[PDB]
Amino acid sequence: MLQGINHICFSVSNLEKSIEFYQKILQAKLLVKGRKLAYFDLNGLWIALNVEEDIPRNEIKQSYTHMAFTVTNEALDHLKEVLIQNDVNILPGRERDERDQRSLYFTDPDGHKFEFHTGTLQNRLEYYKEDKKHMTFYIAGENLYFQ
Amino acid sequence: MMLQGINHICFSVSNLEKSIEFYQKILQAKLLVKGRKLAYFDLNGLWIALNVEEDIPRNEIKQSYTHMAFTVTNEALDHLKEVLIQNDVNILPGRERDERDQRSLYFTDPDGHKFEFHTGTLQNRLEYYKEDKKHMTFYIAGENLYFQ
Ligand SMILES: C[C@@H]1O[C@@H]1P(=O)(O)O
Ligand SMILES: C[C@@H]1O[C@@H]1P(=O)(O)O
Ligand SMILES: [Zn+2]
Ligand SMILES: [Zn+2]
Q: CA dihedral in degrees (A2, A125, B11, A112; nearest 10)?
């Protein structure tokens, strides 16, 4: 089996500009930088940036593939401000239901999509659990009267 | 304000049936829920989601080194290489490794997301890189030198 997440690595075109984004925006802690790499600690997670300077980065804009980090509601508000102050590319979200809970989607300088999300997986499940529930009328097992 | 850690990762996939089977059999993620265009998993406590996007272009991704790595033991790495080959997993040859890198296997899901099974830690790596800086260091300000 697998023992858990080891690291996540991002291919970047401009190591110094990306180091500043990962520090400023994702609040990652720098550990070591080289000529073509950077390692950071993000709340226990090992994040690596590796340079690929002349590669195409325009189809990445089409895919919803993304990574989300946990934030509170006030934190989301303060981070939207931060992403505005720092000229980050902020994506318009998909439509959301209230029970979806709040998110902010944005990308790094090379198009990797990130999200700040205020909920949990179980919230997302209780949400779907509740709507299954809303579509159930005979609780098999229940006792019916007048029979 | 603050971040608290990885909430989830979402992979855009083209074929939901084929992808769920990949994440189940290769990554060993536990499917928790399934729909027309989504599927949610739990893998060792990580929320993994697939969201279908049938008709986007998925060429350039193969040219990018961004990837996600999971920790495994060395025997597990051997086991997993056979699992991948048997299930016809696109295995990549990987970069050149110092033995000090620790062993790895790189490969892709069917839509080109790169993954890695790794047998080292950030600790191992930083210590490897530091043990290199030590090797190129010859004097210690501090010690009792012998003739000044
Ligand atoms: C650890 C940084 O991701 C790179 P590697 O997998 O090439 O070592
Ligand atoms: C949870 C799966 O990532 C998708 P969402 O960010 O659109 O909810
Ligand atoms: Zn998401
Ligand atoms: Zn790696």
A: -100
Cα B45 off chain centre by: 16
**Which DSSP category does A91 fall into?**
E
**Determination technique for this entry:** X-ray
**Secondary structure, 3-state, B69-106:** EEECCHHHHHHHHHHHHHCCCEEECCCCCCHHHCCEEE
A145 domain-assigned? no
**Number of structural domains chain B divides into:** 1
CA of B99 to the centre of ligand 4 (A): 15
* Partner-chain contact A2 B67, CB within 8 Å: no
Residue A92 to residues A26, A104, A146, B23, Cα–Cα distance (Å): 19, 8, 54, 28
Q: Chain B residue with minimal CA distance to A118?
A: B7
Cα separation, A46 vs A36, in Å, equals 17
Q: How far apart are the first and last CA of chain B?
A: 53
Rounded CA-CA distance B99/B78 in Å is: 16
Distances B61 to A38, A63, B40, B146 between C-alpha atoms, Å: 21, 10, 23, 59
Range of the domain at A111: 1-135
Output the CA–CA distances (angstroms, integers) from residue A97 to A86, A94, A101, A117, B48, in the order listed.
29, 10, 7, 14, 20
Angstrom resolution of this structure: 1.7
A66 in any annotated domain: yes
CATH number of the domain residue B90 falls in: 3.10.180.10
Q: Is residue A144 part of a domain?
A: no
Q: Of the candidates A2, A65, A79, which has its C-beta nearest B12's C-beta?
A: A65
Domain-located, residue A16: yes
